[PDB]
Amino acid sequence: GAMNSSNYAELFNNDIKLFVDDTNVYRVTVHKTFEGNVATKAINGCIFTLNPKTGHLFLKIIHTSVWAGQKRLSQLAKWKTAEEVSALVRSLPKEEQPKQIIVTRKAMLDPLEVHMLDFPNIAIRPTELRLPFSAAMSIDKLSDVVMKATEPQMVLFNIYDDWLDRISSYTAFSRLTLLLRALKTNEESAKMILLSDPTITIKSYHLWPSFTDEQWITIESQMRDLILTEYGRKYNV
């Protein structure tokens, strides 16, 4: 069934599962034409497919060429996401295929279900959580590899860097979603917090800075404070 606050811990058991987020698959800029009409220009996008237990991210880059000469692109984006997720599952060895796929938006259920008809024992599930995975393109290294791509490309990452050497999946996921929530609500502030101190660097093979444990506590508190300030501003509370 649907994933919600109650069955949240299922994400960290030993049944292999993936989140799929399609928010950054079809990305456009909107502009005025010479005659003054509005037009869109597509930019490169990505499917965000994440194993929340291990941190393995399967970042499928969606090159603008896949839209060429296609109509109803936002609808096609859903089916292309499902096609690419299905191909990912097919490429994985049997013992690595997920038992569940959790789509962050309900409009993905039917396309994925139809694309996964060959895998009837993989459960496709919606979620009631308001996950901040659209802010993935606020992670500089992910945005960079997406924008530089000149063709369809899959890039693998661990979105948790090396955190799991020291904390649990549950804690790693809560940190990831806190970072992304902050980046979603106020990107400039969030990124300032992360990078202020030039003496805490990001390893070449990592996405986030190499904070010590104490420094992650200070970071997380700063992200919390950011998120609550922005709330009061949004709602006049």
């Binding site: 089916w79 499902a82 096609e83 396309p111 139809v114 694309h115 008809l117 060959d118």
Partner: protein
């Protein structure tokens, strides 16, 4: 014109014949229904005064034999039976007529309602959906479940409707996932019409039979089947023009005939709004659309 005699009427029961119905009192001298139009299937059905649950009944065609009704006090229901002694049967029918103990099938001459509801329904196909091959007539009731329902328990009592499922390999060609799911023309014309039903008339016949089972017995799986077969056509971009025009007539007489008070359980809101207003065929069911709007605007 043919006759279905009744041995007796020992329990108070509402009897239906096609779209007509009569109240019969406990041990009322009732002995059958005469003047039944040859050339169509028919359905005789029952609702006991004591149990407004389980409507039940029998589909038959008088060209296939001499049929009569007899109450069984063990099993507690009016049973259809076949009399193989042709003389003995004309004998019973004539005596009961002379004694005038039979109601007349009350067809108004202008009325094509029953023809229009049963145009494509053939007794031979009914006996494949309701498999019980020692009888020439077919029993259906409120509670019988369909083969598709059973999948998601007793197969002897199943409605063997053709399984339609929009998210199945059958419906979806590999590599045409999106195309085939948004435009079901492949599933309709190649898989269902050319493959399984062989022609449009057998499809319409199963569609009409499902509708009538849902109307007369409140059979919920039949209602599911009727809506599925509508939705398959309406969700296909490429339908023979003759099927569209015939569908509009078929659905029109079904909506016309439905009891006004039952429109809430018998009409799936989603399917109808999708068929009439969103689908490829939104513009091709003018009669059905006009009668739906003027009669059940609330559902829409």
């Amino acid at each position: 014109m043919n006759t279905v005699p009744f041995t007796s009427a020992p329990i108070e029961v509402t009897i239906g014949i096609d779209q007509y119905s009569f109240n019969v009192k406990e041990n009322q001298p009732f002995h059958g229904i005469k003047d039944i139009p040859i050339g169509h299937v028919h359905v005789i059905h029952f609702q006991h005064a004591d149990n407004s649950s389980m409507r039940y009944g029998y589909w038959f065609d008088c060209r296939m034999g001499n049929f009569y009704i007899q109450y069984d006090p063990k099993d507690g229901l009016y049973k259809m039976m076949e009399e193989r002694d042709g003389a003995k049967f004309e004998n019973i029918v004539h005596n009961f007529k002379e004694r005038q103990m039979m109601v007349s099938y009350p067809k108004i001459d202008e009325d094509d309602t029953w023809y229009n509801l049963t145009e494509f329904v053939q007794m031979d196909k009914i006996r494949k959906i309701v498999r019980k091959d020692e009888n020439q007539f077919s029993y259906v009731d409120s509670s019988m479940t369909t083969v598709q329902e059973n999948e998601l328990s007793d197969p002897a009592h199943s409605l063997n409707y053709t399984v339609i499922n929009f998210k199945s390999r059958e419906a979806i060609r590999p590599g045409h996932e999106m195309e085939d799911f948004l435009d079901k023309s492949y599933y309709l014309n190649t898989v269902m019409l050319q493959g399984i039903f062989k022609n449009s008339s057998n499809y319409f016949g199963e569609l009409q039979f499902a509708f009538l089972n849902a109307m007369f017995f409140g059979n919920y799986g039949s209602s599911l089947q009727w809506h599925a077969m509508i939705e398959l056509i309406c969700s296909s971009a490429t339908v023979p023009k003759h099927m569209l025009d015939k569908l509009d007539e078929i659905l029109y007489y079904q909506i016309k005939t439905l009891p006004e008070q039952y429109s809430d359980i018998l009409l799936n809101e989603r399917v109808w709004n999708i068929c009439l207003y969103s689908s490829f065929q939104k513009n091709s069911l003018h009669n059905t659309e006009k009668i739906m709007e003027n009669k059940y605007p609330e559902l829409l």
